[PDB]
Design an enzyme around this catalytic site. Structure first.
Site: not given
Ligand code: MG
Ligand code: ZN
Ligand code: ZN
Lengths: 49, 49, 56, 49, 38, 299, 168, 65
Positions: C34, D3-5
């Site tokens: 994301f 996850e990269d949020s």
RNA sequence: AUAUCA
């Protein structure tokens, strides 16, 4: 309730980047078609498929 | 030998304006191989950019 | 889309906010994260087509 | 935030955290197509347009 | 062999802040009046 | 298009471009489904692609108003090219080629406008005036370098670009009475304010002087103080009045030189206007130095 | 093959002319009009043809004819293929080379790779993805706006009639 | 540009404190850390608001219309 | 055509 873990907390310099969801989001369901190929036009910009 | 008829100003004026604008570093509207991207629009997103 | 798993059939869930939300465990087959990834959605138009998606 | 949020303090966002101004500029010319044809700046009427 | 002025030739674009640019010898307050950012 | 179901005389229909449909605004019936983007479609003809990589770029724009419909490519050098076959196929185009060459008289108009500092809209009127009168029997046998010198003042007189006939006499060439008769047989098929900006600039006067001269000259004409003198003279005279009224003066010799008039003539108009100097000036003119209305030369 | 491909049929004697769909024109504003590169290339073929026809009809100067023939040869040839090895490209005023027929089919983005083997489509939608611990494995969060655009054509049937009438 | 009213993290009004801070520095010569603390800005969220502000407005005012 | 996005 207290967290069983202790959190690494403090100020950090964060940047706001040029990529925003609303300028990205796009949906199509029948729309403009090319003249030659008679197929869906290109890009979000043109309401492409 | 009329001077104004002799020297065509538009030669050098628009000849430079073309290169700087488009970016195909060469003569002129009949460019290839000319090197495109030599001149480009200055990024003004942030000061560092 | 170097996988058959790079295109899979999902159940719609209409939600607010401008992003496509996915279950985290389905991340790996797509190879998504994301960090600014975008994804494609295709809608079947026939009872036949729908069956194909749901059943295969 | 997996996850990269990331999670944002909606309270802080209201207080002005990370808001930004946005300015787009639209341009238009009133072109002259030869001896007679000229584009015009006006409010078009739907009957004759 | 026996024997029997200043002409315009073109417009050259100037690079800003160069010697030929107006903004070269410009002070801080000067630029502001010129609606430029120092 | 008109809705087959409704039919009201002003047929109110919308182009829902975004859904690619043409709808009847009243009943809602869709009248068409295939709908094409004209902007992007026009991008395929006039693009920014000069290199040749764009697969979308597939055509070229032409000008049916000026060059009719002459579709024609040019044999030129490509990546893998021998300099021999280019020459042969070009030497072969030479035998297939008179009036398809008189289009180089457009290159005479284009090189004249650029030598006269004229806009892109003037050239295209001068090229259309020349295409519609160079093969006329009404012009017959006029000086061929004076009929294109007349079609430039025809293109300037519609594009609102102030150019006196003596300004085009300086370019080429012009024989005065020869390109003056030609400027009339084609016509069948300036003012004080025009010169003021240029003359003043050369004069090196301030905006204040220019504006007042401009106001005086108009009033002079309005007043009809100068019965039939040429506008150039009127303007030069008015410039003299205003300038003398202000600090930075300019003499008759200097004004005449810029206006390309003679001091005697400027004198002629000036004295005619001087009597009504008061009426002539702008109302909030500020005479400076020592030059008030009373003091103006009066010459 | 005696029916479908005799060798005599390789050398061009008659030229099939493609209809506008294959080479669209656009009429902008009465002083702007756009023709397709093929329409240009055809006109050259024609002009070169009309020329050589007049030469043969008239006093044939042998070497001035074969000179005009190998011009015709070029225009016809360059129309099907402009990227020919050894030969000069036919160029279009702006310096860009004419988009030959070959070149429209050729690359990725050609008619094959890019209009047939893959093509853009309707009932498609795209946006930024984000994760959710509260969605079920097999579901997908769809933004209201995206749902309000994308459509399913449902047939009116006794089973759905009332429901459908309500959404209508 | 122009002091934020209220700290983003907790929302303690910080809009009033600007001139007062800038004054405790020129007029009182005081170091940044004491001035902030004098002004009662104890939590680092509040401290960062004033300490890291760039009052660009003052440059913006330098242009005529 | 350059820049960029994962
Ligand atoms: Mg990623
Ligand atoms: Zn209707
Ligand atoms: Zn705080």
């Amino acid at each position: 309730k207290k967290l069983m873990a202790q959190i690494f907390f403090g100020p950090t310099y964060y940047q706001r980047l040029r990529h925003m969801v609303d300028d990205k989001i796009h949906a199509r369901a029948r729309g403009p078609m090319q003249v030659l190929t008679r197929q869906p036009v290109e890009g979000r910009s043109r309401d492409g498929g | 030998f009329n001077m104004k008829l002799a020297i065509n100003a538009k030669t050098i004026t628009s000849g430079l304006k073309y290169a700087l604008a488009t970016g195909n570093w060469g003569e002129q509207k009949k460019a290839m191989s000319s090197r495109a991207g030599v001149s480009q629009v200055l990024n003004r997103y942030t000061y560092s950019s | 889309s170097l996988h058959k798993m790079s295109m899979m059939a999902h159940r719609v869930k209409v939600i607010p906010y401008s992003t496509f939300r996915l279950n985290l465990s389905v991340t790996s087959p797509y190879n998504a994260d994301f960090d600014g990834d975008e994804m494609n959605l295709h809608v079947p138009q026939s009872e036949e087509t729908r069956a194909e998606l749901s059943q295969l | 935030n997996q996850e990269d949020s990331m999670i944002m303090n909606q309270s802080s966002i209201d207080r002005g955290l990370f808001r930004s101004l946005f300015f787009r500029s639209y341009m238009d010319q009133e072109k002259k197509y030869g001896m007679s044809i000229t584009e015009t700046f006006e409010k078009p009427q739907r009957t004759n347009t | 062999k026996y024997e029997l002025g200043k002409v315009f030739i073109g417009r050259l674009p100037i690079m800003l802040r160069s010697k030929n640019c107006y903004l070269s010898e410009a002070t801080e307050s000067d630029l502001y009046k010129l609606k430029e950012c120092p | 298009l008109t809705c087959p179901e409704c039919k009201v005389y002003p047929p109110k229909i919308v182009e829902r471009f975004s859904e690619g449909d043409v709808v009847c605004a009243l009943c809602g019936l869709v009248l068409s489904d295939k709908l094409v983007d004209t902007r992007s479609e026009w991008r395929t003809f006039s693009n920014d692609d000069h290199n040749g990589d764009d697969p979308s770029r597939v055509g070229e724009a032409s000008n049916p108003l000026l060059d009719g419909n002459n579709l024609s490519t040019r044999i030129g050098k490509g990546e893998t090219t021998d300099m021999r076959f280019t020459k042969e196929l070009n030497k072969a185009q030479g035998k297939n080629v008179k009036d398809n060459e008189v289009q180089a008289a457009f290159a005479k108009i284009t090189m004249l406008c650029d030598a006269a500092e004229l806009p892109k809209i003037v050239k295209d009127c001068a090229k259309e005036a020349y295409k519609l009168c160079h093969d006329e029997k009404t012009l017959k046998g006029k000086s061929m370098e004076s009929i294109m010198a007349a079609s430039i003042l025809i293109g300037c007189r519609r594009a609102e670009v102030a150019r006196t006939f003596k300004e085009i006499q300086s370019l080429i060439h012009v024989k005065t009475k020869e390109f003056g008769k030609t400027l009339n047989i084609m016509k069948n098929i300036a003012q004080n304010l025009t010169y003021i900006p240029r003359f003043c600039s050369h004069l090196g006067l301030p905006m204040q002087v220019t504006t007042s001269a401009e106001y005086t000259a108009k009033k002079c004409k309005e007043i009809k103080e100068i019965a039939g003198k040429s506008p150039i003279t009127i303007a030069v005279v008015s410039i003299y009045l205003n300038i003398l009224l202000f600090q930075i003066p300019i003499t008759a010799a200097k004004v005449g030189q810029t206006l390309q008039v003679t001091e005697g003539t400027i004198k002629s108009g000036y004295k005619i206007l001087y009597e009504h100097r008061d009426k002539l000036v702008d109302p909030q003119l500020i005479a400076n130095g020592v030059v008030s209305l009373d003091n103006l030369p009066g010459v | 093959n005696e029916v479908f491909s005799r060798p005599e049929w390789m050398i061009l004697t008659c030229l099939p002319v493609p209809p506008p769909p294959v080479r669209p024109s656009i009429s902008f504003n009465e002083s702007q009009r756009g023709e397709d590169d093929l329409t240009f290339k055809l006109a050259d073929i024609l002009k070169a043809n009309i020329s050589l026809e007049t030469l043969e009809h008239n006093g044939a100067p042998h070497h001035a004819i074969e000179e005009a023939e190998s011009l015709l040869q070029f225009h016809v040839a360059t129309y099907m293929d402009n990227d020919i090895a050894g030969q000069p490209q036919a160029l279009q005023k702006s310096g860009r080379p004419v988009k030959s027929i070959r070149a429209r089919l050729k690359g990725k983005e050609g008619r094959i790779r890019g209009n047939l083997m893959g093509k853009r489509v309707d009932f498609s939608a795209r946006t930024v993805i984000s994760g959710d611990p509260n969605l079920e494995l097999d579901q997908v969060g769809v933004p209201k706006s995206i749902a309000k655009t994308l459509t399913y054509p449902e047939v009116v049937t006794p089973y759905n009639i009332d429901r459908l009438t309500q959404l209508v | 540009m122009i002091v934020p009213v209220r700290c983003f993290s907790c929302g303690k009004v910080v809009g009033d404190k600007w001139e007062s801070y800038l004054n405790l520095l020129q007029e009182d010569e005081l170091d940044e850390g004491t001035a902030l603390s004098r002004l009662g800005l104890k939590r680092y969220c509040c401290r960062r608001m004033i300490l890291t502000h760039v009052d660009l407005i003052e440059k913006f005012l330098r242009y005529n219309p």
